[PDB]
Design a binder for this molecule. Sequence first.
Ligand SMILES: CC(C)C[C@H](NC(=O)CNP(=O)(O)[C@H](Cc1ccccc1)NC(=O)OCc1ccccc1)C(=O)O
Ligand SMILES: [Ca+2]
Ligand SMILES: [Ca+2]
Ligand SMILES: [Ca+2]
Ligand SMILES: [Ca+2]
Ligand SMILES: [Zn+2]
Length: 316
Amino acid sequence: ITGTSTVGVGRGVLGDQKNINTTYSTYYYLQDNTRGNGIFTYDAKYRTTLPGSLWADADNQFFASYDAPAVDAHYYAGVTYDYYKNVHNRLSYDGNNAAIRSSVHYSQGYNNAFWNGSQMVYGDGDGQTFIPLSGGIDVVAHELTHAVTDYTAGLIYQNESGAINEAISDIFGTLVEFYANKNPDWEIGEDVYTPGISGDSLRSMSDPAKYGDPDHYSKRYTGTQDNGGVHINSGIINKAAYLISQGGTHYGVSVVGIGRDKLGKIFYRALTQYLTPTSNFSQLRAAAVQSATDLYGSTSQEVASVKQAFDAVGVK
Ligand SMILES: CC(C)C[C@H](NC(=O)CNP(=O)(O)[C@H](Cc1ccccc1)NC(=O)OCc1ccccc1)C(=O)O
Ligand SMILES: [Ca+2]
Ligand SMILES: [Ca+2]
Ligand SMILES: [Ca+2]
Ligand SMILES: [Ca+2]
Ligand SMILES: [Zn+2]
């Protein structure tokens, strides 16, 4: 909408107060004009028609329970935009400052979130399996990274290319969580999963097998569920990325860690310059090795650690 940029205040899903960029024109809207062509957050009003209505509020204060998922979808989209711009010199998900659109209160008791090719969508959860999923900065950045992938490699969402697609979203979701530096970890979704259970999460990058996901190519899922295991076999690539950053010895293979910033640079370059819609795991290894060669040199530690990490998870 056309209006003047303002700053509201509210509480997120976890009860934390934050300021949010809004727009005033009769109402205060969840429209952040400070980032690209805008960040826009919508109310889907428990239906599945999208996007719903641009979020409007009478007083620019967002402290109601119903407001909390919108506050966090809006704010964490902004943090994710800031990460890609400041760290990778990428302007929004298309590299040309495309408007970022999110809808919250999607359906009733919906235990998921997604990028639909046009916008981000967040369920509220059923209150037992999940609380509203925009409360997780790693989840929000996971979804926005699917959009980045859509405009770059275009990894098909099936089998190995889909598991790379998923792992890319978990990797950059986690790197955004570290960027914001509030309780960062290598787990996915811990802030919104199972409010009745402390210490768990949807997935672990540091130890995927904690939640039954494979951590070695020899243990990959080969059936048809989950689009051929895209959220299962992502564990193999997530573990490799974790090893590249943090190091460790895994199935007897030692990896020298090179840190999160270099992990992000290597995988961002792989995603944007080498991966294609049908890339498989072996091709991802080749893209990551080439990317680290470009950035650090063929004889570099960084290149050696990428090779070790893929060796450790059985990907040649
Ligand atoms: C218990 C759950 C929460 C755990 C897991 N989900 C996630 O970890 C986060 N959602 P997510 O993985 O982001 C989304 C999943 C989806 C797919 C289809 C329909 C609805 C939801 N995919 C997604 O948005 O794909 C984007 C894409 C679009 C086009 C091409 C390629 C990818 C699960 O769904 O099992
Ligand atoms: Ca209000
Ligand atoms: Ca965390
Ligand atoms: Ca996390
Ligand atoms: Ca929990
Ligand atoms: Zn995903």
